[PDB]
Protein backbone atom coordinates (compact mmCIF):
# COMPACT_ATOMS: atom_id res chain seq x y z
CA UNK A 1 0.00 0.00 0.00
CA UNK A 2 1.97 3.02 -1.28
CA UNK A 3 -0.59 5.71 -0.33
CA UNK A 4 -2.71 5.83 2.84
CA UNK A 5 -5.00 8.54 4.23
CA UNK A 6 -5.85 9.02 7.84
CA UNK A 7 -8.51 11.52 8.98
CA UNK A 8 -9.29 12.61 12.54
CA UNK A 9 -11.94 14.74 14.22
CA UNK A 10 -10.52 17.33 16.65
CA UNK A 11 -13.97 18.22 18.05
CA UNK A 12 -15.02 14.71 19.13
CA UNK A 13 -11.52 13.24 19.47
CA UNK A 14 -12.26 10.37 17.14
CA UNK A 15 -11.55 8.96 13.69
CA UNK A 16 -13.43 10.92 11.02
CA UNK A 17 -15.70 8.24 9.57
CA UNK A 18 -17.22 8.09 6.06
CA UNK A 19 -15.22 11.04 4.69
CA UNK A 20 -14.95 11.11 0.90
CA UNK A 21 -11.38 11.37 -0.36
CA UNK A 22 -10.44 12.05 -3.98
CA UNK A 23 -6.90 11.65 -5.29
CA UNK A 24 -5.82 13.39 -8.51
CA UNK A 25 -2.63 13.16 -10.60
CA UNK A 26 -1.26 16.21 -12.41
CA UNK A 27 -1.30 15.66 -16.18
CA UNK A 28 1.21 17.04 -18.72
CA UNK A 29 -1.27 19.80 -19.66
CA UNK A 30 -1.48 20.84 -15.96
CA UNK A 31 -5.06 19.60 -15.41
CA UNK A 32 -6.01 17.36 -12.48
CA UNK A 33 -6.76 13.79 -13.54
CA UNK A 34 -8.98 11.54 -11.35
CA UNK A 35 -6.61 8.92 -9.92
CA UNK A 36 -8.28 7.19 -6.95
CA UNK A 37 -11.06 7.70 -4.38
CA UNK A 38 -12.88 6.23 -1.37
CA UNK A 39 -14.53 6.84 1.99
CA UNK A 40 -12.63 6.64 5.29
CA UNK A 41 -13.46 3.57 7.38
CA UNK A 42 -14.57 3.31 11.04
CA UNK A 43 -10.89 3.75 11.97
CA UNK A 44 -10.91 6.97 9.90
CA UNK A 45 -8.45 5.28 7.56
CA UNK A 46 -8.44 4.81 3.78
CA UNK A 47 -6.32 2.02 2.29
CA UNK A 48 -5.92 0.36 -1.13
CA UNK A 49 -6.21 3.61 -3.09
CA UNK A 50 -3.48 2.52 -5.51
CA UNK A 51 -0.65 0.02 -6.14
CA UNK A 52 3.13 0.47 -6.40
CA UNK A 53 2.94 -0.21 -10.16
CA UNK A 54 0.52 2.70 -10.76
CA UNK A 55 1.87 5.15 -8.18
CA UNK A 56 4.65 6.61 -10.35
CA UNK A 57 6.61 9.79 -9.59
CA UNK A 58 4.57 12.95 -10.15
CA UNK A 59 2.43 15.60 -8.48
CA UNK A 60 -0.66 14.34 -6.64
CA UNK A 61 -3.56 16.11 -4.95
CA UNK A 62 -5.47 14.52 -2.08
CA UNK A 63 -8.82 16.28 -1.68
CA UNK A 64 -10.63 15.59 1.60
CA UNK A 65 -14.34 16.43 1.48
CA UNK A 66 -14.44 18.08 4.90
CA UNK A 67 -17.49 20.30 4.29
CA UNK A 68 -19.81 17.31 3.79
CA UNK A 69 -18.38 15.73 6.94
CA UNK A 70 -19.20 18.74 9.13
CA UNK A 71 -22.62 19.17 7.47
CA UNK A 72 -23.70 15.64 8.47
CA UNK A 73 -22.73 16.39 12.09
CA UNK A 74 -24.83 19.58 11.97
CA UNK A 75 -21.82 21.92 12.10
CA UNK A 76 -21.08 24.90 9.82
CA UNK A 77 -17.53 24.52 8.42
CA UNK A 78 -15.17 27.12 6.93
CA UNK A 79 -13.44 25.12 4.17
CA UNK A 80 -14.84 23.60 0.97
CA UNK A 81 -12.35 20.78 1.47
CA UNK A 82 -8.80 20.13 2.60
CA UNK A 83 -6.25 19.81 -0.23
CA UNK A 84 -2.88 18.06 0.15
CA UNK A 85 -0.69 18.66 -2.92
CA UNK A 86 2.70 16.94 -3.11
CA UNK A 87 5.29 15.24 -5.32
CA UNK A 88 5.68 11.46 -5.06
CA UNK A 89 9.40 10.74 -5.35
CA UNK A 90 11.32 7.46 -5.83
CA UNK A 91 14.43 8.72 -4.01
CA UNK A 92 11.36 6.50 1.27
CA UNK A 93 7.76 5.88 0.24
CA UNK A 94 4.98 4.38 2.01
CA UNK A 95 3.02 7.65 2.18
CA UNK A 96 0.60 8.29 5.03
CA UNK A 97 -1.34 11.51 4.57
CA UNK A 98 -2.82 12.41 7.94
CA UNK A 99 -5.34 15.19 8.52
CA UNK A 100 -6.83 16.57 11.73
CA UNK A 101 -10.14 18.39 11.25
CA UNK A 102 -11.85 21.28 13.04
CA UNK A 103 -14.77 23.40 11.74
CA UNK A 104 -12.48 26.38 10.98
CA UNK A 105 -9.08 24.69 10.91
CA UNK A 106 -7.20 21.68 9.67
CA UNK A 107 -3.67 20.36 9.84
CA UNK A 108 -2.04 17.77 7.62
CA UNK A 109 1.20 15.81 7.92
CA UNK A 110 3.07 13.36 5.74
CA UNK A 111 4.47 10.22 7.34
CA UNK A 112 6.90 8.76 4.79
CA UNK A 113 8.60 5.44 5.70
CA UNK A 114 10.44 2.37 4.37
CA UNK B 1 -8.80 45.01 4.98
CA UNK B 2 -11.23 42.18 4.07
CA UNK B 3 -8.75 39.38 3.22
CA UNK B 4 -5.40 38.96 4.99
CA UNK B 5 -2.85 36.15 5.34
CA UNK B 6 -0.47 35.44 8.24
CA UNK B 7 2.24 32.78 8.03
CA UNK B 8 4.58 31.42 10.72
CA UNK B 9 7.67 29.19 10.53
CA UNK B 10 7.52 26.32 13.07
CA UNK B 11 11.20 25.42 12.52
CA UNK B 12 12.68 28.87 13.14
CA UNK B 13 10.05 30.22 15.55
CA UNK B 14 9.63 33.23 13.29
CA UNK B 15 7.25 34.87 10.82
CA UNK B 16 7.51 33.23 7.39
CA UNK B 17 8.91 36.09 5.29
CA UNK B 18 8.62 36.46 1.48
CA UNK B 19 6.07 33.65 1.17
CA UNK B 20 4.29 34.02 -2.18
CA UNK B 21 0.50 33.83 -2.07
CA UNK B 22 -1.89 33.45 -5.01
CA UNK B 23 -5.64 33.95 -4.59
CA UNK B 24 -8.16 32.55 -7.08
CA UNK B 25 -11.94 32.84 -7.43
CA UNK B 26 -14.27 30.20 -8.90
CA UNK B 27 -15.87 31.61 -12.07
CA UNK B 28 -19.29 30.94 -13.62
CA UNK B 29 -17.75 28.18 -15.78
CA UNK B 30 -16.18 26.37 -12.77
CA UNK B 31 -12.60 27.49 -13.54
CA UNK B 32 -10.19 29.12 -11.09
CA UNK B 33 -9.85 32.77 -12.12
CA UNK B 34 -6.80 34.73 -10.84
CA UNK B 35 -8.05 37.10 -8.12
CA UNK B 36 -5.08 38.54 -6.20
CA UNK B 37 -1.46 37.81 -5.30
CA UNK B 38 1.28 39.07 -3.00
CA UNK B 39 4.13 38.20 -0.67
CA UNK B 40 4.31 38.12 3.13
CA UNK B 41 6.32 40.90 4.79
CA UNK B 42 8.92 40.80 7.59
CA UNK B 43 6.04 40.26 10.04
CA UNK B 44 4.87 37.28 7.93
CA UNK B 45 1.68 39.18 7.07
CA UNK B 46 0.03 39.99 3.74
CA UNK B 47 -2.40 42.91 3.52
CA UNK B 48 -4.00 44.89 0.67
CA UNK B 49 -4.84 41.88 -1.49
CA UNK B 50 -8.31 43.15 -2.38
CA UNK B 51 -10.98 45.71 -1.57
CA UNK B 52 -14.38 45.41 0.07
CA UNK B 53 -16.01 46.11 -3.35
CA UNK B 54 -14.00 43.53 -5.33
CA UNK B 55 -14.25 40.80 -2.68
CA UNK B 56 -17.78 39.66 -3.59
CA UNK B 57 -19.52 36.38 -2.68
CA UNK B 58 -17.80 33.35 -4.16
CA UNK B 59 -15.61 30.31 -3.63
CA UNK B 60 -12.02 31.42 -3.13
CA UNK B 61 -8.76 29.47 -3.13
CA UNK B 62 -5.75 30.79 -1.22
CA UNK B 63 -2.55 29.13 -2.44
CA UNK B 64 0.41 29.61 -0.08
CA UNK B 65 3.60 28.78 -1.98
CA UNK B 66 5.25 26.73 0.77
CA UNK B 67 7.62 24.70 -1.44
CA UNK B 68 9.18 27.86 -2.92
CA UNK B 69 9.62 29.11 0.68
CA UNK B 70 11.38 26.01 2.08
CA UNK B 71 13.42 25.63 -1.13
CA UNK B 72 14.61 29.24 -0.92
CA UNK B 73 16.11 28.08 2.40
CA UNK B 74 17.76 24.78 1.37
CA UNK B 75 15.03 22.53 2.73
CA UNK B 76 13.27 19.95 0.55
CA UNK B 77 9.64 20.03 1.75
CA UNK B 78 6.78 17.56 1.22
CA UNK B 79 4.01 19.84 -0.04
CA UNK B 80 3.94 21.84 -3.27
CA UNK B 81 1.76 24.53 -1.64
CA UNK B 82 -0.92 24.87 1.03
CA UNK B 83 -4.44 25.30 -0.48
CA UNK B 84 -7.23 27.03 1.52
CA UNK B 85 -10.60 26.81 -0.26
CA UNK B 86 -13.69 28.50 1.20
CA UNK B 87 -16.95 30.26 0.41
CA UNK B 88 -16.64 33.92 1.37
CA UNK B 89 -19.24 36.65 1.98
CA UNK B 90 -22.29 34.40 1.52
CA UNK B 91 -24.09 36.06 4.45
CA UNK B 92 -22.90 39.59 3.67
CA UNK B 93 -19.34 41.02 3.83
CA UNK B 94 -16.94 39.50 6.37
CA UNK B 95 -13.26 40.06 7.13
CA UNK B 96 -11.03 36.99 6.79
CA UNK B 97 -7.64 36.18 8.25
CA UNK B 98 -6.07 33.04 6.80
CA UNK B 99 -3.42 31.86 9.23
CA UNK B 100 -0.87 29.14 8.46
CA UNK B 101 1.90 27.44 10.44
CA UNK B 102 4.60 25.71 8.39
CA UNK B 103 6.85 22.70 8.95
CA UNK B 104 8.73 20.91 6.12
CA UNK B 105 6.35 17.90 6.24
CA UNK B 106 3.31 19.49 7.88
CA UNK B 107 1.16 22.59 8.00
CA UNK B 108 -1.94 23.75 9.77
CA UNK B 109 -4.24 26.49 8.61
CA UNK B 110 -7.05 28.28 10.43
CA UNK B 111 -9.55 31.02 9.59
CA UNK B 112 -10.42 34.04 11.70
CA UNK B 113 -13.76 35.42 10.51
CA UNK B 114 -15.05 38.72 11.93
CA UNK B 115 -18.14 40.83 11.23
CA UNK B 116 -16.95 44.43 10.54
CA UNK C 1 6.30 43.67 25.78
CA UNK C 2 8.63 40.68 26.38
CA UNK C 3 6.05 37.89 26.94
CA UNK C 4 2.70 37.77 25.13
CA UNK C 5 0.06 35.10 24.50
CA UNK C 6 -2.34 34.77 21.55
CA UNK C 7 -5.14 32.20 21.48
CA UNK C 8 -7.51 31.20 18.67
CA UNK C 9 -10.68 29.07 18.63
CA UNK C 10 -10.62 26.48 15.81
CA UNK C 11 -14.33 25.65 16.27
CA UNK C 12 -15.70 29.19 16.02
CA UNK C 13 -13.01 30.70 13.75
CA UNK C 14 -12.50 33.43 16.31
CA UNK C 15 -10.07 34.74 18.94
CA UNK C 16 -10.39 32.76 22.17
CA UNK C 17 -11.69 35.42 24.56
CA UNK C 18 -11.40 35.39 28.39
CA UNK C 19 -8.94 32.48 28.40
CA UNK C 20 -7.17 32.44 31.77
CA UNK C 21 -3.38 32.13 31.63
CA UNK C 22 -1.01 31.36 34.52
CA UNK C 23 2.75 31.78 34.15
CA UNK C 24 5.22 30.05 36.47
CA UNK C 25 9.01 30.17 36.84
CA UNK C 26 11.24 27.32 38.03
CA UNK C 27 12.89 28.33 41.32
CA UNK C 28 16.28 27.39 42.79
CA UNK C 29 14.65 24.48 44.65
CA UNK C 30 13.02 23.04 41.47
CA UNK C 31 9.49 24.20 42.36
CA UNK C 32 7.13 26.16 40.09
CA UNK C 33 6.91 29.68 41.51
CA UNK C 34 3.93 31.87 40.44
CA UNK C 35 5.27 34.46 37.98
CA UNK C 36 2.34 36.20 36.22
CA UNK C 37 -1.30 35.69 35.26
CA UNK C 38 -3.99 37.27 33.10
CA UNK C 39 -6.87 36.74 30.70
CA UNK C 40 -7.04 37.07 26.92
CA UNK C 41 -8.95 40.06 25.56
CA UNK C 42 -11.55 40.35 22.77
CA UNK C 43 -8.69 39.97 20.28
CA UNK C 44 -7.62 36.75 22.06
CA UNK C 45 -4.37 38.44 23.11
CA UNK C 46 -2.70 38.84 26.50
CA UNK C 47 -0.17 41.64 27.02
CA UNK C 48 1.49 43.26 30.06
CA UNK C 49 2.23 40.01 31.89
CA UNK C 50 5.73 41.07 32.90
CA UNK C 51 8.49 43.61 32.36
CA UNK C 52 11.88 43.37 30.69
CA UNK C 53 13.52 43.66 34.16
CA UNK C 54 11.43 40.95 35.87
CA UNK C 55 11.59 38.51 32.94
CA UNK C 56 15.08 37.17 33.72
CA UNK C 57 16.72 33.94 32.47
CA UNK C 58 14.88 30.83 33.64
CA UNK C 59 12.60 27.93 32.79
CA UNK C 60 9.05 29.21 32.41
CA UNK C 61 5.73 27.38 32.22
CA UNK C 62 2.77 28.99 30.47
CA UNK C 63 -0.49 27.32 31.50
CA UNK C 64 -3.43 28.14 29.22
CA UNK C 65 -6.64 27.22 31.03
CA UNK C 66 -8.36 25.53 28.08
CA UNK C 67 -10.80 23.36 30.07
CA UNK C 68 -12.26 26.39 31.87
CA UNK C 69 -12.65 28.02 28.43
CA UNK C 70 -14.51 25.15 26.71
CA UNK C 71 -16.57 24.50 29.86
CA UNK C 72 -17.63 28.16 30.04
CA UNK C 73 -19.16 27.40 26.62
CA UNK C 74 -20.93 24.06 27.30
CA UNK C 75 -18.26 21.88 25.70
CA UNK C 76 -16.60 19.03 27.61
CA UNK C 77 -12.97 19.11 26.42
CA UNK C 78 -10.19 16.51 26.67
CA UNK C 79 -7.35 18.55 28.16
CA UNK C 80 -7.21 20.20 31.59
CA UNK C 81 -4.95 22.97 30.23
CA UNK C 82 -2.25 23.50 27.61
CA UNK C 83 1.28 23.65 29.16
CA UNK C 84 4.13 25.49 27.34
CA UNK C 85 7.48 24.97 29.09
CA UNK C 86 10.63 26.70 27.80
CA UNK C 87 13.94 28.26 28.76
CA UNK C 88 13.76 32.01 28.20
CA UNK C 89 16.44 34.71 27.86
CA UNK C 90 19.42 32.32 28.08
CA UNK C 91 21.28 34.22 25.34
CA UNK C 92 20.20 37.68 26.49
CA UNK C 93 16.70 39.24 26.48
CA UNK C 94 14.25 38.07 23.80
CA UNK C 95 10.60 38.83 23.12
CA UNK C 96 8.26 35.82 23.13
CA UNK C 97 4.85 35.27 21.60
CA UNK C 98 3.17 32.05 22.72
CA UNK C 99 0.49 31.22 20.18
CA UNK C 100 -2.15 28.52 20.67
CA UNK C 101 -4.97 27.13 18.53
CA UNK C 102 -7.73 25.28 20.39
CA UNK C 103 -10.07 22.43 19.52
CA UNK C 104 -12.02 20.41 22.15
CA UNK C 105 -9.74 17.36 21.72
CA UNK C 106 -6.65 19.01 20.24
CA UNK C 107 -4.39 22.04 20.45
CA UNK C 108 -1.25 23.27 18.80
CA UNK C 109 1.13 25.79 20.24
CA UNK C 110 4.00 27.67 18.61
CA UNK C 111 6.59 30.22 19.73
CA UNK C 112 7.56 33.42 17.94
CA UNK C 113 10.95 34.56 19.26
CA UNK C 114 12.34 37.94 18.19
CA UNK C 115 15.50 39.86 19.11
CA UNK C 116 14.43 43.40 20.17
CA UNK D 1 -4.00 -1.30 26.05
CA UNK D 2 -5.87 1.64 27.64
CA UNK D 3 -3.22 4.32 26.96
CA UNK D 4 -1.09 4.70 23.82
CA UNK D 5 1.29 7.47 22.72
CA UNK D 6 2.16 8.29 19.18
CA UNK D 7 4.90 10.81 18.30
CA UNK D 8 5.73 12.24 14.88
CA UNK D 9 8.45 14.44 13.42
CA UNK D 10 7.12 17.31 11.28
CA UNK D 11 10.60 18.23 9.97
CA UNK D 12 11.54 14.83 8.53
CA UNK D 13 7.98 13.52 8.04
CA UNK D 14 8.63 10.39 10.06
CA UNK D 15 7.87 8.66 13.35
CA UNK D 16 9.81 10.27 16.20
CA UNK D 17 11.98 7.37 17.36
CA UNK D 18 13.49 6.81 20.84
CA UNK D 19 11.59 9.66 22.51
CA UNK D 20 11.32 9.35 26.29
CA UNK D 21 7.75 9.59 27.57
CA UNK D 22 6.83 9.92 31.25
CA UNK D 23 3.27 9.50 32.51
CA UNK D 24 2.25 10.93 35.89
CA UNK D 25 -0.95 10.59 37.95
CA UNK D 26 -2.22 13.48 40.08
CA UNK D 27 -2.21 12.54 43.77
CA UNK D 28 -4.68 13.73 46.44
CA UNK D 29 -2.10 16.29 47.66
CA UNK D 30 -1.86 17.71 44.09
CA UNK D 31 1.68 16.41 43.41
CA UNK D 32 2.56 14.46 40.26
CA UNK D 33 3.19 10.77 40.94
CA UNK D 34 5.34 8.70 38.52
CA UNK D 35 2.88 6.31 36.83
CA UNK D 36 4.51 4.85 33.69
CA UNK D 37 7.31 5.53 31.19
CA UNK D 38 9.08 4.32 28.04
CA UNK D 39 10.76 5.23 24.75
CA UNK D 40 8.85 5.44 21.46
CA UNK D 41 9.58 2.57 19.05
CA UNK D 42 10.70 2.66 15.39
CA UNK D 43 7.03 3.32 14.52
CA UNK D 44 7.15 6.31 16.91
CA UNK D 45 4.64 4.46 19.07
CA UNK D 46 4.60 3.60 22.77
CA UNK D 47 2.39 0.74 23.97
CA UNK D 48 1.93 -1.25 27.19
CA UNK D 49 2.32 1.76 29.48
CA UNK D 50 -0.45 0.52 31.79
CA UNK D 51 -3.36 -1.94 32.15
CA UNK D 52 -7.12 -1.39 32.47
CA UNK D 53 -6.96 -2.47 36.13
CA UNK D 54 -4.45 0.28 37.03
CA UNK D 55 -5.71 3.03 34.72
CA UNK D 56 -8.44 4.35 37.04
CA UNK D 57 -10.30 7.66 36.62
CA UNK D 58 -8.15 10.67 37.50
CA UNK D 59 -5.92 13.40 36.12
CA UNK D 60 -2.88 12.24 34.15
CA UNK D 61 0.09 14.08 32.65
CA UNK D 62 1.95 12.74 29.62
CA UNK D 63 5.35 14.41 29.40
CA UNK D 64 7.14 14.02 26.07
CA UNK D 65 10.88 14.72 26.27
CA UNK D 66 11.04 16.71 23.03
CA UNK D 67 14.16 18.75 23.86
CA UNK D 68 16.38 15.65 24.05
CA UNK D 69 14.91 14.46 20.76
CA UNK D 70 15.83 17.65 18.88
CA UNK D 71 19.26 17.78 20.58
CA UNK D 72 20.22 14.35 19.21
CA UNK D 73 19.28 15.51 15.69
CA UNK D 74 21.49 18.59 16.15
CA UNK D 75 18.56 21.03 16.26
CA UNK D 76 17.91 23.78 18.84
CA UNK D 77 14.35 23.38 20.20
CA UNK D 78 12.07 25.88 21.96
CA UNK D 79 10.27 23.66 24.50
CA UNK D 80 11.62 21.77 27.52
CA UNK D 81 9.03 19.11 26.73
CA UNK D 82 5.46 18.70 25.54
CA UNK D 83 2.90 18.16 28.33
CA UNK D 84 -0.52 16.58 27.78
CA UNK D 85 -2.69 16.93 30.89
CA UNK D 86 -6.14 15.30 30.91
CA UNK D 87 -8.79 13.47 32.94
CA UNK D 88 -9.30 9.76 32.28
CA UNK D 89 -13.05 9.13 32.51
CA UNK D 90 -15.08 5.88 32.64
CA UNK D 91 -18.14 7.43 30.97
CA UNK D 92 -15.14 5.67 25.48
CA UNK D 93 -11.56 4.83 26.44
CA UNK D 94 -8.82 3.43 24.51
CA UNK D 95 -6.76 6.63 24.68
CA UNK D 96 -4.32 7.48 21.91
CA UNK D 97 -2.26 10.58 22.70
CA UNK D 98 -0.75 11.78 19.44
CA UNK D 99 1.86 14.51 19.15
CA UNK D 100 3.39 16.17 16.10
CA UNK D 101 6.76 17.82 16.76
CA UNK D 102 8.57 20.82 15.27
CA UNK D 103 11.56 22.70 16.78
CA UNK D 104 9.36 25.66 17.86
CA UNK D 105 5.92 24.08 17.76
CA UNK D 106 3.93 21.02 18.68
CA UNK D 107 0.36 19.84 18.38
CA UNK D 108 -1.36 17.10 20.32
CA UNK D 109 -4.66 15.29 19.82
CA UNK D 110 -6.61 12.68 21.74
CA UNK D 111 -8.12 9.78 19.82
CA UNK D 112 -10.60 8.13 22.21
CA UNK D 113 -12.40 4.99 20.96
CA UNK D 114 -14.34 1.86 21.97
O1 LIG E 1 -1.87 14.97 11.10
C1 LIG E 1 -1.82 16.09 11.65
O2 LIG E 1 -1.15 17.04 11.19
C2 LIG E 1 -2.63 16.32 12.90
C3 LIG E 1 -2.00 15.82 14.19
C4 LIG E 1 -1.83 16.74 15.23
C5 LIG E 1 -1.27 16.35 16.44
C6 LIG E 1 -0.88 15.02 16.63
C7 LIG E 1 -1.06 14.10 15.59
C8 LIG E 1 -1.63 14.48 14.37
N1 LIG E 1 -1.81 13.59 13.36
C9 LIG E 1 -1.65 12.23 13.41
C10 LIG E 1 -2.42 11.44 14.26
CL1 LIG E 1 -3.63 12.17 15.37
C11 LIG E 1 -2.24 10.05 14.28
C12 LIG E 1 -1.31 9.46 13.43
C13 LIG E 1 -0.55 10.25 12.57
C14 LIG E 1 -0.73 11.63 12.56
CL2 LIG E 1 0.25 12.65 11.45
O1 LIG F 1 -2.11 29.40 12.14
C1 LIG F 1 -2.56 28.27 12.39
O2 LIG F 1 -3.56 27.79 11.81
C2 LIG F 1 -1.86 27.39 13.40
C3 LIG F 1 -1.34 27.96 14.71
C4 LIG F 1 -0.87 26.95 15.56
C5 LIG F 1 -0.34 27.23 16.81
C6 LIG F 1 -0.28 28.54 17.23
C7 LIG F 1 -0.73 29.55 16.39
C8 LIG F 1 -1.27 29.30 15.13
N1 LIG F 1 -1.71 30.36 14.38
C9 LIG F 1 -1.59 31.69 14.71
C10 LIG F 1 -0.99 32.56 13.79
CL1 LIG F 1 -0.35 31.96 12.22
C11 LIG F 1 -0.85 33.92 14.08
C12 LIG F 1 -1.32 34.44 15.28
C13 LIG F 1 -1.93 33.58 16.19
C14 LIG F 1 -2.07 32.23 15.91
CL2 LIG F 1 -2.87 31.21 17.17
Amino acid sequence: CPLMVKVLDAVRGSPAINVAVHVFRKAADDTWEPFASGKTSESGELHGLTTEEEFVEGIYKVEIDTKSYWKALGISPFHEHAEVVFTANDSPRRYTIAALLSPYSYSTTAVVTN
Side-chain angles (χ1 to χ4, degrees), chain A:
Chain A
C1 205
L3 183 68
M4 297 165 285
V5 181
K6 174 124 194 258
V7 191
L8 299 188
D9 184 321
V11 176
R12 288 185 295 164
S14 61
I17 304 159
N18 207 37
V19 188
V21 174
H22 289 83
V23 184
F24 304 89
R25 194 188 186 250
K26 201 170 189 179
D29 72 348
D30 283 329
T31 66
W32 294 104
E33 160 187 53
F35 178 76
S37 63
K39 307 281 267 165
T40 57
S41 68
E42 281 273 344
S43 60
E45 299 195 319
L46 183 60
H47 293 75
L49 278 162
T50 185
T51 62
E52 189 130 300
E53 163 163 348
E54 263 301 317
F55 197 52
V56 296
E57 288 185 305
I59 299 165
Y60 293 81
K61 175 171 78 183
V62 178
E63 182 174 279
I64 305 165
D65 301 334
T66 58
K67 185 173 188 179
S68 293
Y69 177 75
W70 294 114
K71 276 179 174 175
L73 295 176
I75 297 160
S76 193
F78 177 75
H79 305 272
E80 289 300 299
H81 43 259
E83 286 93 341
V84 182
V85 185
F86 67 95
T87 299
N89 164 43
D90 279 359
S91 71
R93 81 218 238 9
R94 282 197 288 287
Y95 296 91
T96 301
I97 307 302
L100 181 73
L101 315 182
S102 292
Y104 279 74
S105 188
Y106 70 87
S107 52
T108 185
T109 312
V111 187
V112 186
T113 61
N114 300 77

